[PDB]
Design an enzyme around this catalytic site. Structure first.
Site, PDB file in Angstrom:
ATOM      1  N   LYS B 140       0.839  -1.186   0.000  1.00 48.91           N
ATOM      2  CA  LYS B 140       0.000   0.000   0.000  1.00 48.91           C
ATOM      3  C   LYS B 140       0.880   1.243   0.000  1.00 48.91           C
ATOM      4  CE  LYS B 140      -2.599  -0.902   3.609  1.00 48.91           C
ATOM      5  NZ  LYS B 140      -3.681  -0.654   4.598  1.00 48.91           N
ATOM      6  N   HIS B 141       0.243   2.393  -0.196  1.00 49.69           N
ATOM      7  CA  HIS B 141       0.978   3.645  -0.276  1.00 49.69           C
ATOM      8  C   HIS B 141       1.656   3.962   1.049  1.00 49.69           C
ATOM      9  CE1 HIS B 141      -1.138   4.840  -4.093  1.00 49.69           C
ATOM     10  NE2 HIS B 141      -1.981   3.947  -3.608  1.00 49.69           N
ATOM     11  N   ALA B 142       2.799   4.638   0.959  1.00 51.80           N
ATOM     12  CA  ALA B 142       3.527   5.039   2.154  1.00 51.80           C
ATOM     13  C   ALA B 142       2.691   6.013   2.974  1.00 51.80           C
ATOM     14  CB  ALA B 142       4.861   5.676   1.775  1.00 51.80           C
ATOM     15  N   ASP B 151       4.305   2.710  -4.222  1.00 49.91           N
ATOM     16  CA  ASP B 151       4.601   4.069  -4.651  1.00 49.91           C
ATOM     17  C   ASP B 151       5.338   4.126  -5.981  1.00 49.91           C
ATOM     18  OD1 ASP B 151       3.349   5.127  -2.492  1.00 49.91           O
ATOM     19  OD2 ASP B 151       5.142   5.942  -1.528  1.00 49.91           O
ATOM     20  N   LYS B 397       5.557  10.575  -1.502  1.00 52.25           N
ATOM     21  CA  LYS B 397       4.579  10.308  -2.550  1.00 52.25           C
ATOM     22  C   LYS B 397       3.503  11.384  -2.605  1.00 52.25           C
ATOM     23  CE  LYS B 397       1.536   8.212  -5.238  1.00 52.25           C
ATOM     24  NZ  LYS B 397       0.285   8.407  -4.459  1.00 52.25           N
TER      25      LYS B 397
END
Ligand SMILES: *[C@@H]1O[C@H](CO)[C@@H](O[C@@H]2O[C@H](CO)[C@@H](O)[C@H](O)[C@H]2NC(C)=O)[C@H](O)[C@H]1NC(C)=O
Ligand SMILES: *[C@@H]1O[C@H](CO)[C@@H](O)[C@H](O)[C@H]1NC(C)=O
Ligand SMILES: *[C@@H]1O[C@H](CO)[C@@H](O)[C@H](O)[C@H]1NC(C)=O
Ligand SMILES: *[C@@H]1O[C@H](CO)[C@@H](O)[C@H](O)[C@H]1NC(C)=O
Ligand SMILES: *[C@@H]1O[C@H](CO)[C@@H](O)[C@H](O)[C@H]1NC(C)=O
Ligand SMILES: *[C@@H]1O[C@H](CO)[C@@H](O)[C@H](O)[C@H]1NC(C)=O
Lengths: 495, 497
Positions: B140-142, B151, B397
């Protein structure tokens, strides 16, 4: 205010002392409905001080307010009225027991097959989005022939005609029968899977699960009838070669024998099969219908067969009768027994295609055959239904796909074709410009509008959901946008 | 009874006349205020310690602080990293005073076609990480800073998209075409992408029909379209015929424009004052930076986006919400991030220029890619000081920071360096399972966005709290999308959507 869509407040107070009143409501269009309780009107605590009560009577069509007291079960007023939407009607009951029902506020106010397919698709998309929430643009509660009941049968008729036309064209081209059979099986399988996966389930509630998946539906039935008709025609196919020639009927005699035996099978299974805990040969709606003595009998033999074969959990949980007859069971309109009648109607479409194709060089002969078939099927429908939506041997019913329903819709479709064929093909007066764009992209348009039902260009938040005008405008705009999308796809030749 | 990635922490307090309270902060926080986890009352009598139960997160690390409720004095602290499904029991007793952590139950957790292959890999990774990727923390995204595998999916896509613009436009110009028709087609494509994003991709329609008061304007596809338009227009306006540092002397105008845009981004981020917020801010706000700036997500970029578009038109659940406990709304595909996206798309255009200008000689192409990757890596190392939260401009990000662009561009250059000889010169691997999305990028993306909830890509789970079930479901959905892309490729259907 507190009024929902199509409801009228009914302020009722009693000018009496020694009786307790309970207002009992029953919509007029129902055949035999038990009088459901609406409100409870107590006695006036003192003389000259009536006790008021608030009621919300559905004003879709008619009402029969029956009043007899709880203590004595003796009538005081039974009057039939037709309330208006968002009205304000006051019922004054007093001694003379007399009632008047005063009103407080006034209620508020080739190319022919392609054109016909486009018309059917546009009407189907309109009535599928809600049709403005009007009661005549939705599927009728059991017996009835509202506008939303006239879309799918015409589409099946058109598909039968197109099946015969394409089969004759391909066989004339010289392709083998095995490749045709493989193609037909592939299209039917694709239609069935698309119907089971994409169209029928609603994924906003959650992911699909086997325990709560609806197997039968519109596209599954469409594909099954497609397969049956195409295979039958491919098997019994003869090369295309007047004045009372009758060639188009006698040449396809095995098809007629098979269709007649299928219709006999449907009639026998509906009217003779013994349904446990239900009268044999039942056609009623169940629920509170037929004076409420048949609570769980919706569909009769067809409903029982569907429940036994597919289980009560794999069917439509909100049948078209659940809004009026309060049926507590699940019944899919696109069941198993109705597939026979759908196949019969698709074969009638094949017959129309045969009439169109055989006598290509004589328009007068085509019109004579079309009007003869229309008259014959109309006579059959009038004989069956006894020109009444409730009485008669077999009432016109969409959920059961009754034989009278098939014959009536075939009569209407044959008349529509008799009107459309000259003007669009022979005279060329009007090419069906705004309609045939979905006529060439039927399946794509249907699947797209089912997938994209909730998106912005077709749905948006309204100022007041309890208003017919806003819903009608939104549905009209959505249907027009789908017509435009079909036009764009046709221009780019994406078929 | 337990959630996913959440161990059970039982505290057995043998103390008599001292209330006990506990705190917990993730080890991945740069500066996070402790949060109340559970309060352990004092033991009524000796031999019957008071026991309290609490659930502690497990995705990455854990730091616990034990403090007296009344005297606010620290008793003990731990840095133990828990397991996914554990039964750790903590006992504190007077001996000074020391706390020992015990495990009751052990945890259970153990053309060129090179551009086409690149874009296919990026698309497949993007589709995997959008579906959830098994709900893993690194898929998952940072949270705010750092660089997880989820990312890397988008910057590579933008890089390859820019390179594809350059390749396609130079091919069209060489074959012979007017510039006005090209510019019109570019404008139409960008507008179509923006409208598709806004109407179809960003909003979720299951929660209700679209309402203008709560429409999310920024997003992935709007940003894609905007950078497409800008970089394509620039490269079309300044386009010289193909003919040694000959790929920069022929591009100095757009290079100067890109440097101007980058300078503008740096100035706006590090110098534009923001009401009630430190100038040149980068922290995630909420409880970050010791919670001194609660509503300061993104700083200058967040403030500019909020000023221009409004709080209602933004992404209401930003990446930092789960960890840093922030209430304001921040859209990762904001307005200031568009400048860095344009810069990365232009870097992709530069890579395509390098690949095209020296098409005959492969040694020159390889040395150019090596030099570019090394230079960008050095720039990234200088910028970020090789640390997740330290350095001048940390890899971020949400902000689309300059270090993000440089690092992801160096990685993309290295991937192209590995892929190009393999797929073209030696021909060892022809991108067999990956380049079909490389051909049907936008169609596959929009299809998976629309059909995210449909059965073959998502079905009811047997156990909603199992990583294995989610991973299997996401892998099956991604494989089905690869199959759909392959089927579309076989039927000659292509980039028209
Ligand atoms: C737990 O107690 C310790 C010591 O009492 C706290 O540490 C100090 O807290 C004060 C204010 O609470 C700060 O001004 C100091 O900088 C802290 N450190 C030192 C060395 O004094 C600690 O803050 C308490 N825990 C929590 C979550 O507040
Ligand atoms: C009528 O109803 C009231 C309460 O609703 C009750 O007290 C009264 O006894 C009822 N009258 C009769 C005749 O049952
Ligand atoms: C009204 O009286 C009829 C008999 O005439 C009875 O069948 C009906 O149930 C009564 N309505 C009630 C009790 O609500
Ligand atoms: C219906 O008419 C009565 C008559 O005065 C009025 O009191 C009532 O408010 C009206 N209904 C509504 C919903 O306004
Ligand atoms: C610990 O908490 C309990 C619960 O309210 C309280 O009665 C007790 O006084 C507390 N201990 C001390 C030392 O205050
Ligand atoms: C943890 O251990 C305690 C005591 O040994 C037990 O009561 C509890 O059920 C265990 N929890 C789990 C999740 O195994």
């Amino acid at each position: 205010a507190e009024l929902k869509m199509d409801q009228a407040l009914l302020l009722i107070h009693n000018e009496l002392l020694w009786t307790n009143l309970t207002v009992y409501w029953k919509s007029e269009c129902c055949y035999h409905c038990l009088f459901q309780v609406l409100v409870n009107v107590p006695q006036s605590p003192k003389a000259g001080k009536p006790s008021a009560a608030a009621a919300s009577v559905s004003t879709q069509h008619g009402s029969i307010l029956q009043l007899n007291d709880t203590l004595e079960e003796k009538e005081v007023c039974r009057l039939e009225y037709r309330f208006g939407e968002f009205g304000n009607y006051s019922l004054l009951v007093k001694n003379i027991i007399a009632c008047d029902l005063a009103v407080n506020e006034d209620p508020v106010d080739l190319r022919s097959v392609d054109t016909f397919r486009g018309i059917a698709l546009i009407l189907m998309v309109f009535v599928n989005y809600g049709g403005g929430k009007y009661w005549y643009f939705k599927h009728a509660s059991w017996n009835g022939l509202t506008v939303a009941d006239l879309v799918f049968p015409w589409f099946v008729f058109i598909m039968g005609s197109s099946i015969f036309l394409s089969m004759t064209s391909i066989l004339q081209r010289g392709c083998s029968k095995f490749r045709l059979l493989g193609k037909i099986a592939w299209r039917s399988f694709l239609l069935i899977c698309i119907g089971i996966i994409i169209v029928n389930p609603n994924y906003c509630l959650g992911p699909l699960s086997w325990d709560k998946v609806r197997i039968p539906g519109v596209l599954q039935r469409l594909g099954v009838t497609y397969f049956v008709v195409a295979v039958l025609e491919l098997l019994f196919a003869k090369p295309v070669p007047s004045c009372l020639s009758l060639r188009d009927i006698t040449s396809s005699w095995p098809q007629w024998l098979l269709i007649l035996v299928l219709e006999g099978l449907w009639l026998g299974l509906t009217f003779l099969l013994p349904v446990p805990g239900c009268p044999t040969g039942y056609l009623g709606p169940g629920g509170i219908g037929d004076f409420g003595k048949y609570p769980n009998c919706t569909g009769g033999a067809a409903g029982y067969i569907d429940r036994l074969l597919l289980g009560d959990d794999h069917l439509y949980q909100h049948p078209s009768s659940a809004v009026l007859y309060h049926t507590e069971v699940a019944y899919d309109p696109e069941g198993i027994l109705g597939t026979i009648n759908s196949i019969v109607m698709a074969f009638l479409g094949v017959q129309a295609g045969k009439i169109l194709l055989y006598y290509k060089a004589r328009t007068k002969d085509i019109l004579i055959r079309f009007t003869a078939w229309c008259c014959i099927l109309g006579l059959i429908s009038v004989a069956l239904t006894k020109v009444s939506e409730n009485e008669g041997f077999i009432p016109v019913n969409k959920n059961l796909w009754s034989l009278s329903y098939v014959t009536t819709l075939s009569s209407f479709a044959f008349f529509i074709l008799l009107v459309l064929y000259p003007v669009v093909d022979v005279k060329g007066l009007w090419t069906g410009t705004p309609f045939f764009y979905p006529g060439m992209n039927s399946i794509l348009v249907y699947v797209g509008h089912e997938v994209f039902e909730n998106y912005f260009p077709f749905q948006w938040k309204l100022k007041d959901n309890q208003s017919h005008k806003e819903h009608l405008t939104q549905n009209i705009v959505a249907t027009a946008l789908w017509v435009l999308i079909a036009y764009i796809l046709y221009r780019k030749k994406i078929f």
